[PDB]
DNA sequence: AGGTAAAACGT
DNA sequence: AACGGTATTACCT
């Protein structure tokens, strides 16, 4: 437990143990919500691929971003969340300092080499202050964290396979962002990254 | 009036 | 390549 900020902290190797069953649980989640890089309001396509499960989904589309119960590829809802993933967030959680937080939704980021994840906040959902516990698994990664405010001083943190990184309260909207994926092996993913990003995004 | 896109090129 | 412009607007509700 490492201090990052208020609110916030990184558990290094938290999910070490649990790395080959969440990669497994990743598999079967996406054997029914594929992988699929999203397309900005403005007509980008986002580099990292994504999916999602539980009951909400995080999604761009025409008019923004979204948090939905329906797989817009599919038009079926988001597949369950994984009990291995429940488990892992909420002991995460506990050892972060948010024994109560309860997600309802999973966004599941796939990174290839050089796909990245520019700066932003996960803003907040309609009557909801939750943290966002993220769990970080495959190929390293540099990690920034900043403030409230785009030019805020950004830390700049490397993260590693079963890395969880927890934040909420005072730096639930910071601004964060991945650089760009360095290619190479990890055996269990052989040539990627893949990020859990737990949320509560429904009252 | 308040929130949101940019979770996306130039120096 | 780290930093910051852009949304310094145009829409929605
Ligand atoms: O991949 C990560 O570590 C961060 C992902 C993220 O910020 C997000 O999906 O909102
Ligand atoms: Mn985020």
New binding site residues.
């Given amino acids: 437990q490492e201090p990052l900020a208020a609110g916030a902290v990184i558990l290094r190797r938290f999910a070490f143990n649990a790395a080959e069953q969440l990669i497994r649980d990743i598999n079967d989640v996406a054997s029914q919500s594929p992988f699929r890089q999203m397309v ?9 691929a ?1 999916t999602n499960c539980g009951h909400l989904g ?1 999604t ?1 589309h025409r ?4 948090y939905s119960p329906i797989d817009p590829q599919t038009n079926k809802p988001w597949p369950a969340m994984p009990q291995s993933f429940h488990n892992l967030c909420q002991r995460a959680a506990t050892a972060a300092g948010y024994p109560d937080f309860q997600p309802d939704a999973c ?1 599941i ?1 796939r990174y290839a080499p050089g796909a ?9 959902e309609p009557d909801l202050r939750a943290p966002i516990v993220s769990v970080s698994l495959g190929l390293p990664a ?1 990690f920034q964290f900043g403030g409230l405010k ?2 805020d ?2 830390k ?1 943190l490397l993260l590693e396979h079963g890395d969880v990184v927890v934040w909420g309260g005072e730096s639930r909207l910071f601004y964060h ?1 991945i ?1 760009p994926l360095k290619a190479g092996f990890h055996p269990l993913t052989i040539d990627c990254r893949y990020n859990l ?1 737990f949320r509560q995004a429904g009252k």
């Fill in positions: 900005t309001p403005g007509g980008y396509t986002m580099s990292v994504m995080w761009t008019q923004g971003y979204l966004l980021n990245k994840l520019c700066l932003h906040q996960d803003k907040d540099i785009r030019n001083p950004l700049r962002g650089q990003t």
